[PDB]
């Protein structure tokens, strides 16, 4: 069974994995205002990955006989100054998610909860792919700041990641 | 182009189609606490339909050269008294969504916006299927109030509706 | 929910879509008395389309939580003077059905019933095909009034429309 | 050729095979008001069998060089007290159809009409299947009068008989 | 039947859907003078869509028993100052077509013509795709005004839309 | 390169190959008023052949580094006295097209333009098929002037030529 301090902190992180998806849906509503429908299709596909991260804390709380509480999801930022700053704010956010998985994992070792630190092993290994898949694109945008020719070619090459959920809906 | 009173009211309804999906995810977190994993798989599949409803207001605002603003999604109710009251509160919610589509459609006729009232024709025809797909199950639960044998058989027959997004995630 | 004046008028039109099928079955009993078994197979296939029109008012009343009342279907006319007058009386009947769909659609706009006027949109678009599929054949019979050679060739070309229900029964 | 007393009595029975189908469509409008959409899909499929019975008297009158006259189809009963009494009134009706086939068959032997008594041999052999397919379900409802668990399981097992005409319309 | 004021206004719009196709054939004769054979293959494929729009007013007038009158198609503009101004003049033209569909749809509601306003529902839903498929390309040309590298890459990516009629002719 | 007198005369003939298609679309709007939907489907398929003739002068002017100018297409005749006179006016028109190809071909030999007279060799060989495909049908209508039985059988046999563009649009 989950203790009161670990069930509350797994519920706070399930709220952060849904505010993540409600932030990558406020960036896709920003890039598709600029006409960058390959950046916007990159961000929507990341807002469906992050829903799949919150259905893993959800299925873990009901495997360990807990109870999921849903709080309010706050207002995400609307606009950024440039498509560079919209990825420096998505990479600063992925270092805020990982900072809070490491304080879940340092919480499960204090309470001697071996079946939770075994579960956070998936999210520690997967945030290494999340920080690097954004730092790749963030370094292609510092490679082209006053060059619309390259930004036109980043829109197309990132359009290979298309969301699969509108194909079902 | 969308007027200021119609772009604001299409943005308020995109917030209601995402609070819908954040309400059917607070019912799936209720039925899966009772051990009713067929009611909980019904509700998660409805929380992925309602995300697909908010990606239609989203793609309409960027077809009509607007701008999507995302507000905060409030706290949904946690627990209900019974699995009957958890569907009387999902049917009262589907009569609140439809009350606000009819005040979008009575707004687009006041502003003489023929390309928006043509778009809400999909959501008027589809809320007739949403109010009836809940009133079917709500009438099977008033048919069995002190009968766990039938509630055990509603859990299995509603488990045919499984969410397709965990199969991709 | 359907109001008392709209549930009564949807029930009157479900009685007209079954008297339609009981009129095209009194024309098929007329053309097959003259030996015109291609005109008679045209009319029986229209009496199975019109049953399919009354199973759409029927499924709409039980989607909107109503109650279908069945009145008596009156006696259709037995004989007409010619196979021309048996289509001038089927085209005058298809202008009587459409006159009553337009008084359902002008009733749903008076009561501000957006989910019924959305439903009658199918029957407004489909009576345009019904008035034209009879006016085609009615204009081929004014093209041949004292010519049995052409009436022998309208019997065969209209025999391509065969009823599918005797193939199952 | 058909005599005047046998053409009139074959036309009266073609009116009873269409009031049959307009009675099983007033029971399907009753069971689908109670939410029993497997009883209602049983009754609609019987209202398409009984139309196929009246297209056999119809094709026999035009094989024997007669003339089909269509009278008015009266008002069927609207509601019954229970789903038991809605099958005791469909079994009392199938003993009224068979009572009138036996008075057609005792009419064709009085007029020495061997080609009509040969034709009613199909309807005598088929009403034995009609009285027994209703007495099966009528005896499953006297087996469960104060048991909604079994009535919930008769709704599903009778839903295997689905009408084929809405699949074409 | 179509009234004299609605048959005249449906005939004026069939003349505008053929002057549309005779304008997108004067832009394809402009882009293929500049050597932009991907812009020119985009415009020819739009001049075959707009012929398909005038064969829908044509088939509607002969479903409603009218008469199509063909007036003269005026001289389209020959040259524009740039490939930007050749899309600002095709987007100003698609806001002139839609302004005249909305004055057909506001004409069919004044004459209480429900079967014409039901037909213009296709053209209201489809001009939303026409104004947006031009505003996409018009915003890619304001993204590159003094950049021939990007205009060379818009010629190729718009060459995926090839006209199907020279493949048959 | 094309001279000024040959570029102007190739542009005048591209205007005649589009007024041809706007004449066979005023005959299809005449035959489909008489209910002759096989004559009307013959004429629409000829109005798509003649568009394919004007896309050959168009692709030749941009192979020879010219410039296509589009003038106005005048009003075609609305009605003729009979379906005989609607083919005597389409055969008199096909002798007016061929009279002007022969004055293009006698113009390219005066200017010693061997690459244009080589191109008009296709249109000289193809107008022999156009004058004969109309003179076949024109001689079947002088074979039946007071015979609606044969005119009913010319409508069906000419309906094998169906336009392929509405199948794509």
Numbering used by the authors:
A (entry chain A), B (entry chain A), C (entry chain A), D (entry chain A), E (entry chain A), F (entry chain A): 1 to 169
Paper text:
We demonstrate the performance of this device by high-resolution 3D structure determination of three protein model systems, apoferritin, T20S proteasome, and tobacco mosaic virus. To validate the suitability of cryoChips for 3D structure determination, we collected datasets for three test specimen (P. furiosus ferritin (ApoFtn, 480 kDa, O), T. acidophilum 20 S proteasome (T20S, 700 kDa, D7) and tobacco mosaic virus (TMV, 37 MDa, helical)) that we selected for differences in size, shape and symmetry.
To probe the resolution limit of data collected using the cryoChip, we merged data from three chips filled with ApoFtn acquired on a Titan Krios equipped with a post-GIF K2 camera and processed it in a standard single-particle analysis workflow. We used 2D and 3D classification to select a final set of 21,238 particles (O symmetry) from 815 micrographs and after 3D refinement obtained a reconstruction at an overall resolution of 3.0 Å displaying visible side chain densities. The reference model for 3D alignment was generated from the data itself using the stochastic gradient descent method, suggesting that the quality of data collected from cryoChips is sufficient to allow initial model generation even for samples considered difficult for reference model generation. To examine the compatibility of cryoChips with the condition to form vitreous ice, we evaluated the fraction of images containing crystalline ice by manual inspection for the presence of ice rings or crystalline reflections in the computed power spectra from all images. This led to a fraction of 86% (815/945), 75% (91/121), and 52% (43/82) of images that we classified as containing vitreous ice for ApoFtn, T20S and TMV respectively. Analysis of the orientation distribution showed increased abundance of views along the fourfold rotation axis for ApoFtn, indicating preferential alignment of particles with the SiNx membrane. To quantify this concentration effect, we estimated the particle concentration in the nanochannels by segmenting and counting ApoFtn particles, and measuring the channel volume from the reconstructed tomogram.
